[PDB]
Amino acid sequence: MSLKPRVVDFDETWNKLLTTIKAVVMLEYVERATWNDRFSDIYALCVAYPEPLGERLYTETKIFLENHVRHLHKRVLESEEQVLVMYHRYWEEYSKGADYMDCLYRYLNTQFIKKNKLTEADLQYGYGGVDMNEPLMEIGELALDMWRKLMVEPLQAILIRMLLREIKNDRGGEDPNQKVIHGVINSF
């Protein structure tokens, strides 16, 4: 049976996984059979005969996401005054990519993360936390929290200033693209 705990190369498996991951997050077409085959590598990693390897995979995915968001931040902050129309493109891409990614890590979410996840109850009434650590979170939660942490905070003042300025232009009567502005506001 190929569903029995076994020994496989973590690095070799990650090499093959990253190729599919990069195409997925960019909303690029991937072969359905390849998707189905990759869906089993996650379980193969999560149950390794010597020792479980989910911990390393978590940080590896985190660092890949951080590298990609850094590249996107570079590209966006390079353009000046075109951020309005640029924002929508890669926000649309990243949101769908995050949703699909959260779908794809379902087993890791269900069997690993929730056990060490912080219960919402103590995050509310209990408090009880002051450690210098980031507790394990959902993959989509990682994606969104990181996206807020690393991109919107440095580049918020100029965006809000130009949105307020465009509000005056609309008060003048002219109507810019309502879809783009609505999506930008809804992103908040």
Partner 1 sequence: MYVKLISSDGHEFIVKREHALTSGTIKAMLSGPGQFANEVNFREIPSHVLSKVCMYFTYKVRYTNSSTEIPEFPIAPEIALELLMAANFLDC
Partner 2 sequence: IYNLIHLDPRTREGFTLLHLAVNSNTPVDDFHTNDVCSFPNALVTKLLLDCGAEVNAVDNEGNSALHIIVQYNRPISDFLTLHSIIISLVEAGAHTDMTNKQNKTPLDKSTTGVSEILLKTQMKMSLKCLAARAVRANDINYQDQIPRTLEEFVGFH
User: Binding residues for partner 1, per CB under 8 A?
Assistant: 1-4, 24, 29-30, 32-33, 35-37, 39-40, 43, 100, 103-104, 106-107, 110-111
188 interface partner picked from partner 2, partner 1, none, CB below 5 to 8 A per type: none
Do 117 and 136 contact (CB within 8 A), yes or no?
yes
> Which DSSP symbol is given to 151?
I
Rounded CA-CA distance 111/28 in Å is 29
Write phi, then psi, for 162 (nearest 5 degrees): -70, -30
Among 2, 119, 133, 178, binds partner 2 (CB under 8 A): 119
52 touches partner 2 (CB under 8 A): yes
Scanning 15-23, 53-61, 117-125, 129-137 for contacts with partner 2 by CB under 8 A, the matching segment is: 117-125
Answer with the entry of partner 2, partner 1, none that 176 interacts with (C-beta below 5 to 8 A by kind).
Answer: none
Residue 112 to residue 109: CA distance in whole angstroms = 6
Q: If we measure between CA atoms, which residue out of 88, 86, 89, 188 comes closest to residue 144?
A: 188
Q: Which does 86 bind (CB under 5 to 8 A by kind): partner 1, partner 2, none?
A: none
Of residues 119 and 186, the one with the C-beta less far from partner 2 = 119
The half-sphere exposure of 139 on its side-chain side, counting CA atoms within 13 A, is 24
How far is it, in rounded angstroms, from Cα 159 to Cα 142? 24
Separation of first and last alpha carbons in the chain: 48
Contacts for 69 with CB less than 8 Å, ≥ 6 apart: 146, 147, 150, 151
| Residue number with CB closer to partner 1 (61 or 151) | 61
Number of residues that bind partner 2 (CB under 8 A): 12
Which residue in the set 39, 71, 126, 170 belongs to the binding site for partner 2 (CB under 8 A)?
A: 126
The item of partner 1, partner 2, none sharing an interface with residue 36, based on CB under 5 to 8 Å by kind, is partner 1
Min separation Cβ 111 and partner 2, Å: 6
Q: What is the DSSP letter of 81?
A: S
Q: Considering the complex, state which of residue 45 and residue 151 has its C-beta at the smaller distance from partner 1.
A: 45
Binding residues for partner 2 (CB under 8 A): 4-5, 47, 52, 111, 119, 121-122, 125-128
